[PDB]
Ligand binder design. Structure first.
Ligand SMILES: Cc1cc2nc3c(=O)[nH]c(=O)nc-3n(C[C@H](O)[C@H](O)[C@H](O)COP(=O)(O)O)c2cc1C
Length: 101
């Protein structure tokens, strides 16, 4: 129930949907999320080596799980177990990415 959907067919693969659980965890309103790339949750303590693996997984359109530090609106650190998965259409072509926190 804690998930976001991004559209890679739009500039910079922005979040088009976020579940109420995701808004509660990050302390952002729906209006502050829609249209942004998910990277805005990152900050000083975010391991750049883990961010690299996510970039490679998106490029290759492979599913991946990783732990990384993210920041709430009020600058509170929390660990995030992130399960990234591609979503393909009936013609086997990529439409969306789904993330789980
Ligand atoms: C559906 C989806 C959800 C994502 N959720 C997160 C997240 O919760 N935290 C995070 O640090 N990165 C998340 N990312 C990855 C970042 O938005 C971004 O891909 C990452 O920083 C690497 O790309 P960049 O090098 O262009 O920033 C998510 C990506 C997708 C497609």
């Amino acid at each position: 129930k804690n998930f976001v959907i991004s559209d890679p067919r739009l500039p910079d693969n922005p979040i088009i949907f976020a579940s109420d659980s995701f808004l509660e965890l990050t302390e952002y309103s729906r209006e502050e999320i829609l249209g942004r790339n998910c990277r805005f949750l990152q900050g000083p303590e975010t391991d750049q080596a883990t961010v690299q693996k996510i970039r490679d997984a998106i490029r290759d359109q492979r599913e991946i799980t990783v732990q990384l530090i993210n920041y709430t609106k009020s600058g509170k650190k929390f660990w995030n177990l992130f399960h990234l998965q591609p979503m393909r259409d009936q013609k086997g072509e990529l439409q969306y990415f789904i993330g789980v926190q």
